[PDB]
Write a protein that binds this ligand. Structure first.
Ligand SMILES: *[C@@H]1O[C@H](CO)[C@@H](O[C@@H]2O[C@H](CO)[C@@H](O[C@@H]3O[C@H](CO[C@H]4O[C@H](CO[C@H]5O[C@H](CO)[C@@H](O)[C@H](O)[C@@H]5O)[C@@H](O)[C@H](O[C@H]5O[C@H](CO)[C@@H](O)[C@H](O)[C@@H]5O)[C@@H]4O)[C@@H](O)[C@H](O[C@H]4O[C@H](CO)[C@@H](O)[C@H](O)[C@@H]4O)[C@@H]3O)[C@H](O)[C@H]2NC(C)=O)[C@H](O)[C@H]1NC(C)=O
Ligand SMILES: *[C@@H]1O[C@H](CO)[C@@H](O[C@@H]2O[C@H](CO)[C@@H](O[C@@H]3O[C@H](CO[C@H]4O[C@H](CO)[C@@H](O)[C@H](O)[C@@H]4O)[C@@H](O)[C@H](O[C@H]4O[C@H](CO)[C@@H](O)[C@H](O)[C@@H]4O[C@H]4O[C@H](CO)[C@@H](O)[C@H](O)[C@@H]4O)[C@@H]3O)[C@H](O)[C@H]2NC(C)=O)[C@H](O)[C@H]1NC(C)=O
Ligand SMILES: *[C@@H]1O[C@H](CO)[C@@H](O[C@@H]2O[C@H](CO)[C@@H](O[C@@H]3O[C@H](CO[C@H]4O[C@H](CO)[C@@H](O)[C@H](O)[C@@H]4O)[C@@H](O)[C@H](O[C@H]4O[C@H](CO)[C@@H](O)[C@H](O)[C@@H]4O)[C@@H]3O)[C@H](O)[C@H]2NC(C)=O)[C@H](O)[C@H]1NC(C)=O
Lengths: 42, 139, 110, 42, 42
């Protein structure tokens, strides 16, 4: 119950070894560590 | 105006070819579209291949049997049909138009360069149309 | 997918007719551009354009043709019609690929 | 009459704090700092 | 016969002076300095 909203998946885009091609890289982050701007975060 | 190849009759099973020509080379920046007009059933959009040569979109419903080519040197649009079923017995029109190549999501770099951009383009209009070529398939 | 109403029309010459193309999606890219255009096909003739982006007519079409709308509701209000304006009408949406026509509105003089 | 054409109101594009977006930003530049390539200067 | 494929004529899209437009630019590279993915090499 204490982790309701305490972790975020926060998948986002990046550039691969080639600066032209794209790569959709997913990660993990803590709620205290991102800010809202589904719902986008930075 | 535009010019299209003359009316054609084909036995079902083989392929057919249609040529759309511009007068000289006055229509090169405009993009190319192909449309079909089944009588009493409205009009369908065959596809398009853009003008810079970076797009080749053809509707999946006709993807297997229809090919669209553009010869730069002669400035000629080529439409190739393979199945030539009863449903293809209709009038095919070559159209010259313009699009809007908007820039959607783009990943700038830290120094300010452009890593990549989807820059999906939107169809704007089809100003110039061919006289229409009738293709008749009879068994 | 796209539709428009009424399916068929019959208006006395000299009056004004209005046909509405109902879409199924936003049809707006940013806020103002409305990637929907009107195309008219005369009997036994190649279709002719009347108005692109549902806002502005092209060069070579008179003032009679006028289309306006937003979001998903777009109407063309053809005013002061004559015998040269009888034919079928279609609406192209370029917002989403693949781009499709309509089912056609056949206008007749009443 | 002295400062006619010696100040340029230039608007352009910049990378914002994030990177997936860019912003339109206007500024004032002295004529001695810009060179032609409204008109496109650099 | 000793340079069969040793030298590669590679062109890319390096940015021009100003960081907004791309320019097609060609160069030569030694085969030990490129890796395949005409074809695509990095
Ligand atoms: C990494 O980069 C990729 C780029 O490849 C990026 O992908 C985007 O992802 C978002 C979110 O998934 C997409 O946004 C969705 O768009 C749906 C419809 O998109 C149409 O319109 C797009 C342009 O409209 C956007 O921009 C305008 C102007 O700013 C704005 O008004 C709109 O609201 C919208 O934000 C257009 O680019 C897009 O084109 C796709 O399809 C065509 C046709 O196949 C193809 O040719 C293109 O290549 C492209 O694939 C399409 O035409 C929209 O319905 C959806 O709406 C959501 O919310 C509503 C309401 O809650 C829900 O009802 C709905 O179900 C959805 O959940 C959403 O807005 C965006 O279109 C993607 N971009 C592209 C180019 O594909 C990733 O997000 C990046 N990763 C990040 C940022 O982490
Ligand atoms: C900062 O970043 C923004 C990013 O958005 C950028 O704005 C955009 O710039 C691009 C680049 O020009 C613009 O793309 C053009 O858009 C026009 C339409 O513009 C009208 O409509 C929009 C709304 O949709 C209005 O906002 C705008 O004010 C105008 O009223 C298109 O018509 C253009 O298409 C032509 O170019 C394409 C390739 O780029 C071709 O594929 C296409 O066929 C068109 O060809 C044209 O050129 C041909 C010769 O090359 C000619 O023969 C044809 O007849 C035709 O004229 C083009 O896509 C885009 O609209 C801008 N706005 C947005 C919201 O994206 C800023 O410019 C940038 N600031 C800088 C760099 O300082
Ligand atoms: C630097 O930037 C320039 C432009 O800014 C790029 O130049 C264009 O690059 C694109 C690639 O993104 C090229 O587009 C591709 O062209 C291929 C050429 O194919 C020829 O042969 C086929 C038959 O096999 C013909 O049908 C075709 O008309 C051509 O004559 C196409 O085959 C490619 O099509 C594939 O992708 C499209 C979508 O992109 C699909 O719809 C197709 O089905 C198919 O899968 C593609 O269109 C374009 O030709 C280039 N133009 C020029 C003038 O160079 C550079 O590539 C870029 N360089 C670098 C290093 O970044």
């Amino acid at each position: 119950d204490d982790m309701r909203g305490e972790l975020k998946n926060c998948s986002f885009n990046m550039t691969t070894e080639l600066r032209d091609k794209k790569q959709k890289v997913y990660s993990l982050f803590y709620r205290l560590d991102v800010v809202q701007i589904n719902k986008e975060y930075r | 105006q535009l010019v299209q190849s003359g009316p054609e009759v084909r036995k079902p099973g083989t392929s057919v070819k249609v040529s759309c020509k511009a007068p000289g080379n006055t229509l090169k920046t405009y993009d190319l579209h192909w449309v079909r007009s089944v009588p009493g059933q409205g009009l369908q959009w065959m596809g398009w291949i853009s003008h810079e040569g970076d797009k080749k979109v053809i509707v999946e419903r006709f993807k297997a049997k229809v090919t669209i080519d553009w010869d730069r040197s002669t400035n000629t649009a080529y439409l190739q049909l393979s199945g030539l079923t009863s449903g293809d017995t209709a009038v095919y029109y070559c159209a010259k138009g313009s699009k809007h190549r908007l820039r959607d999501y783009a990943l700038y770099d830290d120094d300010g360069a452009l890593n990549w951009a989807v820059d999906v383009d939107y169809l704007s209009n089809l100003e110039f149309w061919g006289q229409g070529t009738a293709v008749t398939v009879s068994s | 997918v796209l539709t428009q109403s009424p399916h068929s029309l019959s208006v006395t010459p000299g009056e004004s007719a209005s046909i509405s193309c109902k879409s199924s999606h936003s049809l707006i890219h940013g806020d103002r551009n409305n990637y929907l255009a009107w195309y008219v096909q005369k009997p036994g003739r190649s279709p002719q354009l009347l108005i692109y982006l549902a806002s502005s007519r092209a060069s070579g079409v008179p003032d009679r043709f006028s289309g306006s709308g937003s979001d998903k509701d777009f109407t063309l209000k053809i005013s002061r019609v004559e015998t040269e304006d009888v034919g079928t009408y279609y609406c192209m949406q370029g917002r989403e690929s693949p781009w499709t026509f309509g089912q056609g509105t056949k206008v007749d003089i009443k």
